[PDB]
């Protein structure tokens, strides 16, 4: 449209306002690309927050998955004690 | 909105919406400080539940 | 008394769950007004894509002062149309508030 920007504005070469007609659409389209990127600002800052939710969630899992480690480390240790009484009977009823 | 042609309207919508921008920002001041305080209760009670168990 | 109050939990768990959708219906209607930005609005205040046409159809009116009123006409329109769209957003938010 830039040839058309000088096709429709041929008698306006004496007019200073031909450059305003030139300056019109560039002043539009500079703003339209701002707002498209300004959507992209609020779109990213949601995702920037939304990624941080998962960052807590992965942290909160493995901290809690460290807890079931200690429970299973305890419970397996306790079932080891529970097997002692089973073999204490096989020891004693033979020794009786 | 105002000063594109409406210098008079700059005080109009700024009087209308600039209050409500300021009021919603004061709600944004208040609630973030509450969530920061409510998160602090969760942090201590999570440390509490570990402490009891 | 235990059965008295769990029978009062059930309205309050439903009434909360009723207002969850009625909150979000306002949010969906706020997203329409959200959809244009700060400078999309400023893009509208320039009469570009008609501003050359604002001086194409008004070439002999350069002696006329009223050419600027023709310029001043649509900007005085569109400043009001964005007010009322946001004024809908006022009553829309205060319901949700």
Numbering used by the authors:
A (entry chain W): 207 to 302
B (entry chain F): 266 to 318
C (entry chain L): 158 to 254
Give verbatim lines from the article.
α-Xenorhabdolysin is a PFT that has been first isolated from the bacterium Xenorhabdus nematophila. Xenorhabdolysins are also found in other entomopathogenic bacteria, such as Photorhabdus luminescens, and human pathogenic bacteria, such as Yersinia enterocolitica and Proteus mirabilis. They are composed of two subunits, namely XaxA (45 kDa) and XaxB (40 kDa) and are only active when the two components act together. Xenorhabdolysins, which were suggested to be binary toxins, perforate the membranes of erythrocytes, insect granulocytes and phagocytes and induce apoptosis. In contrast to previous predictions, XaxAB is therefore not a typical binary toxin, but rather a bi-component α-PFT.
Most of the complexes contain either 12, 13, 14 or 15 subunits. We used the highest resolved cryo-EM density of the tridecameric pore complex to build an atomic model of XaxAB. Each subunit consists of a XaxAB heterodimer with XaxA bound to the back of XaxB. This results in a localization of XaxA on the periphery of the pore, whereas XaxB resides more at the center of the complex lining the inner pore lumen. Interestingly, the transmembrane helices of XaxA that fortify the inner ring of helices of XaxB, do not completely span the membrane. Depending on the number of subunits, the inner diameter of the pore narrows down from 140 to 170 Å at the membrane-distal part to 40–55 Å at the transmembrane region. The inner surface of the pore is hydrophilic and mostly negatively charged suggesting a preference for positively charged ions and molecules. At the outside, the pore complex has a conserved highly hydrophobic band of 40 Å corresponding to the transmembrane region. The hydrophobic band merges into a positively charged stretch that is formed by the conserved arginine and lysine residues of XaxA (R290, K291, K293, K295, K301). Besides the described twist of XaxA, the α-helical tongue αF of XaxB folds out forming the transmembrane region.
